[PDB]
Each structure stands twice: as structure tokens, then as C-alpha cells.
């Protein structure tokens, strides 16, 4: 009866991570990457400011949630965090826009080494990598969060059983000693996937203190947390916050780490809508 996965309607909501200079990142994402600034919220009582950016409204699209901590101008990215990706129908056009705007292209546009898909890489002001992926027409340009993991097979099993993700793609690249998987809730080219990368013989990475978590919406945080609890008893990872409403707000969430220590927050799909204004 973990056929709850089949009855839920989960959705990748946003990646949350920290930035040294909020205005600098906003300007880089709007001007270099063509994102929209969706919402900005200042929180003096707790000493931070958030900004939310993406390619459509947060009720239908995935977003980045940026956290600026007062008087903190840098973070450790760590070695485990891979990249965010942006799909675009002309990666040459986009890369040259980024260069024009004074952005950093670290990997010029061209087919992936060993494959055919045209990709490029940009580096943002804090050091976060953005892959650019040539793709004809997606409803979701902000289309990957890539994380490194120590055991690809353990992680695939974990995301399937804990989160109801489908394994969309698994690809071994022995010439370059890595293997990838993409997991998510719809066809890869229509959605935001989680891309997990294993490098041969590498079992550990630093989580840093820059990337915080990914948030995933669910029709019921209690049912979905039960599935997480079962998966963690078998496969590794740990519940952080048990399912329930947050103090005062009544917004229902649960949170956990995966077998490698990456954090995921489950948020009630309807409660999530309560801040999107």
C-alpha cells in the first residue's frame, strides 16, 4: 500500500540555495539567463531576504528560491553539488547573450563529449554551475537539478521508493568514468528532473553550505512521509522534520535527507499556494 505514489500528484517546486549578493544574482539571472523575477520577500526578524525566479509562475513552474543572509557574502559550494540546467531552443544564441552581458561561459556550446545533444556551461556569481541544454520547446526551461551520489543504484532505488519518482534515463559513460540517472514525475523533456551523477570509485562528496534543498509538492505530506520513512529504514537517509503544519502558518511540510545527505522538503500542494502572491 505504497501505491500512494500512483494516486498522488507530485511536482518539483523549487531549489533553495544561498547567495552572497542578492541583487547581483537577480541581475545575472534576468539579464544572462532570461529568468523572470517572480517575488522578493524581506525577513528582518530572521535576518534574511528571499527572491524567487523562473520562467513561469510558481503554481505551474519550477523556480529557484534564493536566500540572502544579512552580512554573509560567500558560501562553500562543496564537491557534491552539480548544476542547475536551463533548456533553450538555441544554446548558441543563449551562450552569446550570456557573454555579451558579462556572464561566464566555462564550456562553450557544442555536442556533449561522446554524445550528440548540444550543451554549454555558465558559472553564476557565487560559483553555481548552470548547464545549458538545447531543447526544441519545453514547458519547463528550468529543467534539472544535478547532484553527485556515492552509489547510483542505491540512489535510484531510494528516489523511486521514497518519492515515487520514475527512472527516466540511466546512462553509463565509461570513456569518462561516470554514470548518470534522471528521475522525475513526467517525461524528461517536459519537466524538471533530478539528475544523479556517479563518478567511478567516488563514494563521498561534501554537501557544502550553499545548496540547501529541493522542495517537492504532494497532495498529502503525511502519506508521502510514510513512504520516505519506509525507504529510509531499508536504504538509508533520515527524516528531519516529521509531517505537520509549521508553527503559526499551518503550512504542512515534512523534510528528510537522502542516503547521501541531500535535503528534500515535501510541501502540501495547496498550502504551497498560500505564499505565491
Ligand X SMILES: N[C@@H](CCC(=O)N[C@@H](CS)C(=O)NCC(=O)O)C(=O)O
- Catalog residues that contact ligand X under the rule CB under 6 A: 82, 107, 112-113, 148, 176, 178, 180, 197, 199
Question: Which has the closest alpha carbon to 185: 166, 169, 170, 160?
Answer: 166
Q: Identify what 180 binds: ligand X, Co ion, none; CB under 5 to 8 Å per kind.
A: ligand X
Question: Which has the closest alpha carbon to 212: 114, 32, 75?
Answer: 75
Q: Residue 4 Cβ, how far from Co ion at the closest point, in Å?
A: 29
Q: Identify what 199 binds: ligand X, Co ion, none; CB under 5 to 8 Å per kind.
A: ligand X
Toward ligand X, which CB reaches closer, 97 or 199? 199
Toward ligand X, which CB reaches closer, 24 or 104? 104
Question: Which has the closest alpha carbon to 260: 203, 209, 195?
Answer: 203
Toward ligand X, which CB reaches closer, 122 or 266? 122
| Angstrom distance (rounded) from CA 29 to CA 18 | 14
Measure Cα distances from 129 to 9, 91, 117, 147, 185 in Å.
Answer: 30, 15, 18, 11, 24
Q: Residue 91 Cβ, how far from Co ion at the closest point, in Å?
A: 13
Q: Residue 41 Cβ, how far from ligand X at the closest point, in Å?
A: 33
Q: Identify what 264 binds: Co ion, ligand X, none; CB under 5 to 8 Å per kind.
A: none
Toward ligand X, which CB reaches closer, 178 or 222? 178
Q: Identify what 197 binds: ligand X, Co ion, none; CB under 5 to 8 Å per kind.
A: ligand X
Are the beta carbons of 221 and 268 closer than 8 angstroms?
yes
| Angstrom distance (rounded) from CA 213 to CA 22 | 18
Instruction: Give one word for 156, left, alpha or beta, with left for phi > 0 and alpha for psi -120 to 50.
Output: alpha
In the complex, the residues that contact Co ion under the rule CB under 5 A are 85, 131, 144, 146, 195
Q: Identify what 176 binds: ligand X, Co ion, none; CB under 5 to 8 Å per kind.
A: ligand X
Q: Residue 116 Cβ, how far from ligand X at the closest point, in Å?
A: 11
| Angstrom distance (rounded) from CA 125 to CA 18 | 11
Amino acid at each position: 500500500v505504497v501505491d500512494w505514489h500512483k494516486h498522488d500528484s507530485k511536482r518539483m517546486l523549487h531549489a533553495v540555495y544561498r547567495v552572497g549578493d542578492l541583487d547581483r544574482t537577480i541581475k545575472y539571472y534576468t539579464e544572462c539567463f532570461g529568468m523572470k523575477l517572480l517575488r522578493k520577500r524581506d525577513v528582518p526578524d530572521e535576518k534574511y531576504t528571499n527572491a524567487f525566479l523562473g520562467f513561469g509562475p510558481e503554481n505551474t513552474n519550477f523556480a529557484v528560491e534564493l536566500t540572502y543572509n544579512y552580512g554573509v557574502d560567500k558560501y562553500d559550494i562543496g564537491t557534491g553539488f552539480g548544476h542547475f540546467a536551463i533548456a533553450n531552443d538555441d544554446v548558441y544564441k543563449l551562450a552569446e547573450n550570456i557573454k555579451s552581458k558579462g556572464g561566464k561561459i566555462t564550456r562553450e556550446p557544442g555536442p556533449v563529449k561522446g554524445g550528440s545533444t548540444v550543451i554549454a556551461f555558465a558559472q553564476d556569481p557565487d560559483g553555481y554551475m548552470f548547464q545549458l541544454i538545447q531543447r526544441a520547446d519545453t514547458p519547463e526551461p528550468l529543467c534539472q537539478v544535478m547532484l553527485r551520489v556515492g552509489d547510483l543504484e542505491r540512489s535510484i532505488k531510494f528516489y523511486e521508493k521514497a518519492l515515487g519518482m520514475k527512472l527516466l534515463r540511466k546512462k553509463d559513460v565509461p570513456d569518462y568514468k561516470y554514470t548518470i540517472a534522471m528521475l522525475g514525475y513526467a517525461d524528461e523533456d517536459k519537466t524538471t528532473v533530478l539528475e544523479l551523477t556517479y563518478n567511478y570509485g567516488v563514494t563521498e562528496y561534501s554537501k557544502g553550505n550553499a545548496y540547501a534543498q529541493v522542495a517537492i509538492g504532494t497532495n498529502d505530506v503525511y502519506k508521502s512521509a510514510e513512504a520516505v520513512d519506509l525507504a529510509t529504514k531499508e536504504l538509508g537517509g533520515k527524516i528531519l522534520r516529521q509531517p505537520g503544519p509549521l508553527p503559526g502558518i499551518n503550512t504542512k511540510i515534512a523534510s528528510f535527507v537522502d542516503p547521501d545527505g541531500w535535503k528534500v522538503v515535501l510541501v502540501d500542494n495547496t498550502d504551497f499556494l498560500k505564499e505565491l502572491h
